[PDB]
Amino acid sequence: STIEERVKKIIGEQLGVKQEEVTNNASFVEDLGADSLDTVELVMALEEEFDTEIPDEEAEKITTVQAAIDYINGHQ
């Protein structure tokens, strides 16, 4: 139950993809087939399991799995 594992399992649950496809370099829209409603709900899912508010300006940068991992670990 590490930070990287929690982020990857959140993305796998929100996008309905197996843990095999959620690569660190995998883009939400390009590689995981994510409508922008799914990306906003994915940010809101990262705000629930981590209980931290993600501003919309920073959520626009979160486009890959590594971007979400770097955000969660880089802020606090």
Ligand X SMILES: *P(=O)(O)OCC(C)(C)[C@@H](O)C(=O)NCCC(=O)NCCC(=O)NCCc1ccc(S(*)(O)O)cc1
Residues belonging to the active site: 35
| Cα 43 off chain centre by | 6
In this chain, which of 1, 16, 20, 37 binds ligand X, going by CB under 6 A? 37
When the beta carbons of 3 and 40 are compared against ligand X, the nearer one is 40
Residue 64: beta bridge partners?
A: 27
Which window, 8-16, 26-34, 35-43, 67-75, contacts ligand X (CB under 6 A)? 35-43
Give the footprint of ligand X on this chain (CB under 6 A): 36-37, 40
